[PDB]
Structures are given as C-alpha cells and as structure tokens.
Amino acid sequence: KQIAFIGLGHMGAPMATNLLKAGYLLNVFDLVQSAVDGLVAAGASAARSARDAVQGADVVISMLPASQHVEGLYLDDGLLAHIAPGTLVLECSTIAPTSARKIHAAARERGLAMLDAPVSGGTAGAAAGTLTFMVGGDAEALEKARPLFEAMGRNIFHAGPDGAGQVAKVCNNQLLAVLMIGTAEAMALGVANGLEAKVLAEIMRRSSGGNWALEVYNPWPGVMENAPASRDYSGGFMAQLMAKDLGLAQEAAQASASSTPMGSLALSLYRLLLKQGYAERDFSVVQKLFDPTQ
Amino acid sequence: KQIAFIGLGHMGAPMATNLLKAGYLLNVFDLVQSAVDGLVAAGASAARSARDAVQGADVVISMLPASQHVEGLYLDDGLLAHIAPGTLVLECSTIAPTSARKIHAAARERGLAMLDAPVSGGTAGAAAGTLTFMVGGDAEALEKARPLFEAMGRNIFHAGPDGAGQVAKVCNNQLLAVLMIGTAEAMALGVANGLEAKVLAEIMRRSSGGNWALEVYNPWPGVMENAPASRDYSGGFMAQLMAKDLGLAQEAAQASASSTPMGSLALSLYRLLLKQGYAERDFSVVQKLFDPTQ
Amino acid sequence: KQIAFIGLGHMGAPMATNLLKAGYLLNVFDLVQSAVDGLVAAGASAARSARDAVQGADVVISMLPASQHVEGLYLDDGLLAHIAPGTLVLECSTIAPTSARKIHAAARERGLAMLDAPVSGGTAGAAAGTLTFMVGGDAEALEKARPLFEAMGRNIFHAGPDGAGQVAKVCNNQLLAVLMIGTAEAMALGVANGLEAKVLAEIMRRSSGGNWALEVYNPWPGVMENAPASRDYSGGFMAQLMAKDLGLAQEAAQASASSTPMGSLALSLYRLLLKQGYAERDFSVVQKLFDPTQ
Amino acid sequence: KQIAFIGLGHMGAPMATNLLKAGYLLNVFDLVQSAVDGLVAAGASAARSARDAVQGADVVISMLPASQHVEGLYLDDGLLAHIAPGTLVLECSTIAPTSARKIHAAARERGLAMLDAPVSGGTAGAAAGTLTFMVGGDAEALEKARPLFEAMGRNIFHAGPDGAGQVAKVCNNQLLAVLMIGTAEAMALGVANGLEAKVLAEIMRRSSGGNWALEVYNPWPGVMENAPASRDYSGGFMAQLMAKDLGLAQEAAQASASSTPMGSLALSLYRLLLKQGYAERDFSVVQKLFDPTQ
Numbered sequence A, B, C, D: 001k002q003i004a005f006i007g008l009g010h011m012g013a014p015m016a017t018n019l020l021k022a023g024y025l026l027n028v029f030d031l032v033q034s035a036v037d038g039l040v041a042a043g044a045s046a047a048r049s050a051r052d053a054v055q056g057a058d059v060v061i062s063m064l065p066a067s068q069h070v071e072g073l074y075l076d077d078g079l080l081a082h083i084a085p086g087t088l089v090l091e092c093s094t095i096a097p098t099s100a101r102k103i104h105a106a107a108r109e110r111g112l113a114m115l116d117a118p119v120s121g122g123t124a125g126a127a128a129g130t131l132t133f134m135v136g137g138d139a140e141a142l143e144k145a146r147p148l149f150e151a152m153g154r155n156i157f158h159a160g161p162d163g164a165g166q167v168a169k170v171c172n173n174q175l176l177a178v179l180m181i182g183t184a185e186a187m188a189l190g191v192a193n194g195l196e197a198k199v200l201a202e203i204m205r206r207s208s209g210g211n212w213a214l215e216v217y218n219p220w221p222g223v224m225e226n227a228p229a230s231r232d233y234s235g236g237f238m239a240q241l242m243a244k245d246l247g248l249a250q251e252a253a254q255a256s257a258s259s260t261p262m263g264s265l266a267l268s269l270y271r272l273l274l275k276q277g278y279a280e281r282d283f284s285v286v287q288k289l290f291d292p293t294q
C-alpha cells in the first residue's frame, strides 16, 4: 500500500491529503513546488519526478487538468513506459473518452490494471472525502481499488469498461450545464415578472422544474447564502473548467454522431461568458447573462 | 359550500370528482355532454350553462385549455358579468400572466375575490388529489380557498399577487422542458458511446446532473417501466400542451425583455416534434429526436 | 391627391417629406410637436389631430412604432370610425400579421380599400426614396396606391392578400437577424484563428457563405468604413427594433405551429444585448458578443 | 509539369480530369480501382501506389475525405517521407486547421513548398472547372501553383499563411449552414402563414434577408426547378459532409475559445437529420425539418 500521486492541484492536493489521513504512504509530484510542499508537510515524501514517484509504487494515481497533459505524461519516453509490474493505475482526470480508451489499451499492452475514474464533486468535496467516482474498467481492478476510492470519496459507480467513466462524467456535466443555465434563465424570468427570487426558487425546487442546482447550487444571489452566487461567484467550480467539459462532450457526440442542441448551446453561452472575463468565476456566474443589475 | 365547476376535461373531471368526494355540492358544465355525465353519475348536478352553474354558487372554479377560452368565458355578455356577490373565484387554467392580470382586475372591479391557481402535476395526480397549486392573489382569498385546494391537492404555494401563479407555473414548466430535453440528449449520448441506459441514468440521478425527470420521468424506454417511455409514450402530459406552455413562457419573456435561450430552443424542438405527428404523445417523446432505433 | 400622414418619426418624417417633394398636399400629425414642425417647414399643414388630418383626405398613411399603437389608433372612438368614404388607407408600420388582418377586415367592413405595406430599408433609404414595400391586399388598391409607393420607394412587391405584407416583412427580417449573427460569429472565428478581417470578409462574400450583410453591412469594424460598425455602432437600425421584429416573428410561428430554431436563438441573443445596454445601437452591435477587444 | 494525383472521388475525379484536359501528365491513385480506371481512360497513367505516383512528380495534389485519412497518408512510413525534392504539394482536402498546420510544418521540415488549398463549389463546379480555392501558405508557392488552380477553378483567394485556407473554408461553410437553415425556416414560416413559396423567395432574395442560398440554392421544392429540392434532394452536397465541416468548425472554435451559437445549433440540427436517415441527401434536405407535407 504505497502510492504515487501525480498532480496536486485544486482537487489533487485534498485527494492526496485524504489518502495520507487514511494511512497510505505517498510519493507526490507536481510541476509546482508549493503544491508538493503542501503534501510534504502533511506527511508525504516528494518524488523528484513522476517517474521517480512511480518507481516503488503499488498504485499510481493522477489528477491533471486535461487530455493533452495526461496523454503527454503517459505516452511516449512517456512515464507509462517506466511504470510498473502488477501496479494499479487510477486515472482520475477528466479527459476525452477516446483519449482514455487509448491509454487503457496501452495499460493492457503491459499487464497493468488501469481504471478511468473521473471525479464529480468539487474542491469542497475533495476536502471532505465525499467525492463521486465514475469508473470504467474491470470489476477486477475496481474491487482492488475500492478501499482507496472510499478514502477519497463516497459514491462509487461502476459505469462500464475502458472509458465508461469519462463517458458518464461528460454526460453528467453537460446536463448539469444545461439545468444550471435553465435554472438561471427561469430564475430571471420570474423575477422580471414580479416574483420574489426565494419564493420562485422553492416552488420550482419542490416541483417538476426541480433539479440539482435548485437543490444545492442556486445561481441567484441571496437565495442560498452559502452558494457562490451569494458571494459574487468567487471560488467553486470555474466557468472555464465547465467550458472544457462541454468541449469534451462535443467530442464524444461527434464520434457517435449524437445531437446535443442544449449542451452545444450551453457551450456557446459559456464561451460568451469567457469573453466577458469570467473564466475564473464559479460556473453559476452564468446568471449574469440574464441579470444586469448585478 | 356550493360550487360551480366549469371545464371537466382531463384535469377538470378528476378535480371536480375529488371535490365531490370531499363533501361539496357541485354545479358542473362542459361543452361536452359525456363529461358532464361523468360527474353527474358521481353525484353532481349538471348546469344548463356556465351562467346557470354560477347562479347560486359560493365559489366558481374553471379548468379550461387556454387563454382564448378563459378570457372568452369571463369577458364580455361574458359570464363574468352574470357572476356573483361575495363569491370566491378560482381560475386554475394555465394561461398567460397578462391574460390573468386582466381577469383579476375585472374581479376587483366587482368585489369578487379571485385567485389565479394554475395546477402542476398530471392526470394521475389530479385523480389522486395530490396536485400542486401555484397561486397569485390575496392571502385573504387564499385562506378562504385553502380547504378546496387541499381537497384537490397537496402542495399549495402562495406565489404572489394577481398573476404570480401563472408566472411561477410558466417558469416551472419551461425549466421542465429544458431538463427533459437535456435529459433525453444526455441519455442518448451515453448510450451511443457504449453505456447501459439504466446505469447511466442512476449515475446522473444521484449526481450533479440530477433532476426531476431522472427522478420520476425518465425519457429512455426501459429505464423506468412505469413511465410513458416504457409504453411508447402513450398517455401522460401531451407534447402539444408542453408546446403551449412554452409559448406562454415566450410571452412573458417578451414583456419583461427576458432572454430565454434554452426555453426558446426547447420550444423550437417541440414544434419539430409536432411536425413529426407526435402532438398527442407524452412530452418525453422528445427522446425520439435523439434515438432512431425506437 | 390630398394625404393624411400620421407618424413622423425616424421613418415617418422622411417618407412624408418625399411625398411633399413629389407634389402631394399633406395633413400631418404626431404626438411630438417638433416632428410636425419639421414637416410644416418643408411645406405641410399640421393637423390638430389624427382625426382632423384624415377629415378631407384621399389617402391615409400611418407609420407608427408597434402593434399596440396602431390598433389603438384605428380601433374604437378609434380614428378608424371617423375615417372616410372611398379613401385609400396605407398601413406601413411593421406589426403582427394577426393585428393587420384584424384592421384590414374592419377596413372591409367600411368599404375602405386598405393595404398593409410595411417597409424594409432604413432611415437612409427612407430619405433617399429607395425603400422596399411589401404589400398585402387587393391588386385593385395596390395599383391605385403605386404612384405614392414610387414616390417613397423603389421595389414594390405584392406579397399577397390582407396581412401578406407583414408576413413577408417578418420572415425577411428574421432571416436578416440570423445571417447577421451568423456573419458576426463567422467573422470573429476567422479573426481568432489568424485571418485578416477584410480578407475573410471578401472570401465569404464572393462565396457560398455570401449574404446581404457581407454585401453591404459588415458587422466587423474596419471592414466597411461606411458601416455602423466602423463608427462604434451609432445610428442605423436599432438593436431594440430588431428584437421587436423577432418578437413578431415568434408570434407568427406560434399561430402556424412553425419551428424557428435560428430565429428564436437570434431573439434570445438580441435580448442579452439589450441587457448589456445596447438597445439604441445598430443591430450589427451583435458583433460585440463575439469580440471583447472592441 | 508532371503531376501525382491522389484521391479520385466525387471531387477528385473531375479535378484530375480537368488537369488532363489542360495538358498535364498525371499519375493517379485511389483505393478504388474503378476510379483509377475512369482517369486512365481519359488519358492518365495509374500509379501502383501513392508513393509510386509521387516518385517522378513536380507537384503532388491530394483530394481525400477527412483529417484522419490525410494525416494518415502524409504522416509516418507515411508517404510524406518518400516524397520529393523541389516538388509543389497541394493539399486540397477540407481538414481541420490544426491538422493542416501540422502537415505544413513537416513540409517546411523538408524544403517542400506546400499549400493548403481547400475547395468550395460542388461536383458540378469541379466538372466545369469553376471551383473556388482558399489558400494558406507562401505567395511564393501560390504563384508557382496558380496555373493549376486556374485549370481546375476560377476564384483563387490567398487567405493567409499555413492553415489559413482551411480556416476560411470552415468559416465559410459554417455560415452557409446557418443561412441555409435560416432560409429553410423562413421559407416554411411564410408558407404556413399563407404566402406563395416563389413569391416569398423573390422578396427575401432581393431584400435584406438575401443570401447565397436564396440566390442559387433554394431549399423549397418548386422554387428553383434546377435545385436539389426540386428533385427530392438527390445529388448535390451531402448532408453528412456538411455535418463534418460543422464539426471542423467546432474544432477551430474551441482552440480559439470562440462562441458559435448559430453554427453549433446548425450542427445539432444536421445530426438530427442524419438520425432521420438523410446523410446521403443534399444538405438543403434540412428543409424537411420544417415541412411535413413533403
């Protein structure tokens, strides 16, 4: 039970921390020294390199930003050559299914049991150890992996074989974008026609218009004091990241010749938002398209 | 406690029936004799006319299909002249806010305490007495009215003053259209990329993509055996009616200069569906835009 | 050949002026005194009222902003009662077809030969006498009317019977909104991928992407020095007015159960623009949604 | 002046034929023997291979279906290694800019002067030698290349440096999709509100709604007897190919973080069309989304 952890960013750091607090030994690596230092103070050893970290490890976990970086790091010279014997590889970044199926197959072509296990939840849930994993790959691996997932998270869904994790993640987050936008526009329509935001919200929440966002993440400021909207959209899940996910969803749709009118429109709208300088705001900042007075 | 009930259609009939089973005396009227006859056998007296029905009544309730009909019936000669003294008027049709604010004001201009109380739920909920009412108007009236609402329904929300009911209803149903379409496209994207429908569904339901439709009304056939989708989209809430509601939502948005990119797109898509001959199918038949093999 | 002219706004004033410069006697009226005064100095008599203006007239022409005002002014007390015997009525405002068919029928119900003759072109074309008329009604009337249309305009299309004018206008302007937005997004895509605006423009203009906007009204600043875009979107055809027209198009679509995914989306986008404070800018200001650096 | 021609499909065959009829010697190759045979009968020699064809050639021209195939054929073993000394390479397929910039750079890394020169026009224009080329690369190459372009085409635009051709093409065809859909929906709106198709068409063509499609490619059957629509959408430019182009446009937009609400919506709609079995119909078959009676 010795782990290599590569990628200690907004999600990487707290996930790696919860693994330490669970009793695992970690070799961490990250392009950014202050991130390695964070985990070293919490009781991990820094590895000189991804390669180094991996040399000696039972399981290798990566949490990096996108497709490029992940394929880069696993795909020759690439660390995946240098990797290991009977080691469990857990690829938890959110990347394009194609990109994950490719990496999986190279895992196969080396006996390595790998899983794509993208995460849903946020920085707040990464810290609390309550994240949701969506996993492609063998039940074989999964069960070997479960004890780790349980340390970093709560709901563990087996979504299918190589790539299924990414597929479910992409599908889920696209629908999220849609209901969030749908929620922001509905919110602003009622308010503009005379309704009190909080009243309108509760009605739709308890009704057929009900959805995740209205439950826990209202885009309208004041409705939920605890939400990004009530603090001018700071923190939370970046608009820029949501756009990326939507981008991955487009990629999947084109492969399957799928039609995604709402998702694609949502994407178009998030890009507008990025034009308006909101890339680093919470994705609910999409509310600003409908309300000026903000 | 003598009621005039005008409009005994898919929703009207069971609502009027549950009022009888609650111990109210009703005078019912409907352009269609077999509908009056239904309620007469269950123990109501038929009224020769809307006017007749109303003559003698404490409260007048109407459940008609659209704006036209409702304004027609209340708006001169129109029955609203012939109406009553201290009688409670309950307008439960789903109509345009403008149209409801107009009628309210004429109620005012005659001392009549009126409420707009559109219903959410369906034929199944109208029968079970579990409907949701969304009410504009005075708390004054509302409390007088509550005992009736409780007989026909469960959740009773006071949404605001004259017209607020219609506003909340329109807002709610537009978001519904959006999440349902968003749900159908997401469902079909995952399936096309190799996922099992039922698996994908549960994941998104328990996750940030979660919504009313995934909870209780999955558009994908087989996922929920109890749903319209599992019986080729028969019964339920008509696609044609959803289009109407979306139409009312557009109306509200134009008055308030509101932007509704998702709702308007949803509308565009429902009209396509009507072109394909699906007007009388359940609104989840929207799933057919994404899946051919059906 | 004595004319009553009611409505002397951005379009009304120059149209009425070109009628005077053609040798017609006018009785003008407008809620705004400085507008009547403009036409009085150019050689028209002010009428105390719409009614007054009309009393004595061979033909009555109106150029008002919307449906409300036009129905208001013609529809009882309403001036249409007070009107005339064998007088030609020319309704050149852009209003909803329904609204125009209603007015036409009241014209019928009084022997008055009326035409709906909405105008396409702008302030610049109203001044030059080069406007395009799109006419519903009888060939009978039309030919009687032609000499006036020729004085105020160039292309005169007979679009059909009562209401056809408005229908063609609405259809035309909706497609305009679409190609203009389509032009602005394409412009900004090429530029962002390294192309020179002017080069990209000429290519698409001469090619299958070619359209009115690229011919004469490029939304990209610098491409055409003569265009609103090259002068920060001042003057021209207001964004607010385009939104109104799109609104009328929605109205027509709902009556005919027509699907308008592009038009409706265009509408959604124009409303966003109005939220950003651009109501009084030229409709090509839609370019600002795609380009920040502006 | 000896040419290697690789790819003799719908566009490849007639382009290669017009080069022969211009007095060039060709070595042709194609995975499909009947296509090589076509060009052999018209006076070309078949090459055993892409490689063979190229060995001996002054200029190498390729006209293949997509990104995959083109990168495949040029990108190692890949034919681009085996290629040539001071030979002119003309890559006329429509592929993703990224994909073209990559290939260009490998051309550089071997002294080979290459151009991306995607074609606009159709099978009919490929045959007539009237195609439009949109070219990225050096003026240097271009002028060397011009005499060939003139043999296969008419308008030759220099769109910029490496990749610009593809960029302009993608931008142009996305706007095309938009105006075509915009044209089909407008057509069907007017007809549904009582207008004669042909009348409505001419009005919008001569007016601000005017565009390429209305000029030469009306999607409404009967309007132009010469058009795909008048012969049930057979022949012309495939719906499936248009979807591909839209896909490439999405790719470019994501790289530049560009917003393309109309293009993306157009894409969503074309995919629906493919679901309905129309992949091999002319792209104007999009008209069928708005008109059932067809």
Ligand SMILES: NC(=O)c1ccc[n+]([C@@H]2O[C@H](COP(=O)([O-])OP(=O)(O)OC[C@H]3O[C@@H](n4cnc5c(N)ncnc54)[C@H](O)[C@@H]3O)[C@@H](O)[C@H]2O)c1
Residues within 6 Å of the ligand: A006, A007, A008, A009, A010, A011, A012, A029, A030, A031, A032, A035, A050, A063, A064, A065, A066, A069, A073, A092, A093, A094, A095, A119, A120, A121, A122, A123, A236, A237, A238, A241, A245
């Ligand atoms: N942040 C969120 O709220 C959120 C929530 C759920 C899922 N996700 C998904 O998770 C993924 C990662 O999210 P994040 O916010 O942690 O990203 P992040 O940018 O905050 O962290 C990525 C880390 O990876 C490191 N890294 C990059 N390249 C590396 C290399 N080749 N070798 C070693 N380390 C390298 C960086 O130093 C950085 O610290 C994304 O794909 C995202 O969509 C994000």
Ligand SMILES: NC(=O)c1ccc[n+]([C@@H]2O[C@H](COP(=O)([O-])OP(=O)(O)OC[C@H]3O[C@@H](n4cnc5c(N)ncnc54)[C@H](O)[C@@H]3O)[C@@H](O)[C@H]2O)c1
Residues within 6 Å of the ligand: B006, B007, B008, B009, B010, B011, B012, B029, B030, B031, B032, B035, B050, B063, B064, B065, B066, B069, B073, B092, B093, B094, B095, B119, B120, B121, B122, B123, B236, B237, B238, B241, B245
């Ligand atoms: N049906 C549903 O699943 C559903 C669910 C929730 C809300 N709604 C809303 O409720 C409203 C009514 O729904 P419904 O399904 O009962 O409509 P319906 O068509 O089934 O019934 C309307 C009834 O009104 C009667 N009627 C029409 N004109 C009349 C007149 N002027 N005088 C007396 N009676 C007249 C008709 O005879 C008919 O029986 C709609 O506005 C709808 O959007 C419908």
Ligand SMILES: NC(=O)c1ccc[n+]([C@@H]2O[C@H](COP(=O)([O-])OP(=O)(O)OC[C@H]3O[C@@H](n4cnc5c(N)ncnc54)[C@H](O)[C@@H]3O)[C@@H](O)[C@H]2O)c1
Residues within 6 Å of the ligand: C006, C007, C008, C009, C010, C011, C012, C029, C030, C031, C032, C035, C050, C063, C064, C065, C066, C069, C073, C092, C093, C094, C095, C119, C120, C121, C122, C123, C236, C237, C238, C241, C245
């Ligand atoms: N302005 C344009 O560039 C443009 C171009 C083509 C078509 N149109 C269409 O033409 C119509 C009018 O355009 P406009 O720009 O001249 O509007 P406008 O607002 O500039 O002028 C309308 C005039 O009507 C007068 N008016 C309003 N109510 C009146 C009343 N009841 N009695 C007498 N006069 C009254 C007002 O005083 C005003 O001067 C609109 O429907 C518009 O969509 C506008």
Ligand SMILES: NC(=O)c1ccc[n+]([C@@H]2O[C@H](COP(=O)([O-])OP(=O)(O)OC[C@H]3O[C@@H](n4cnc5c(N)ncnc54)[C@H](O)[C@@H]3O)[C@@H](O)[C@H]2O)c1
Residues within 6 Å of the ligand: D006, D007, D008, D009, D010, D011, D012, D029, D030, D031, D032, D035, D050, D063, D064, D065, D066, D069, D073, D092, D093, D094, D095, D119, D120, D121, D122, D123, D236, D237, D238, D241, D245
């Ligand atoms: N067809 C049109 O109406 C049209 C119009 C303008 C532009 N375009 C663009 O032009 C491109 C090609 O169009 P097309 O219709 O000629 O395609 P096509 O499918 O008709 O022809 C492609 C040809 O390339 C050959 N080919 C495929 N792989 C090969 C290989 N590796 N080696 C040698 N030959 C190979 C095939 O045998 C085929 O004959 C597309 O990218 C398209 O978007 C098409």
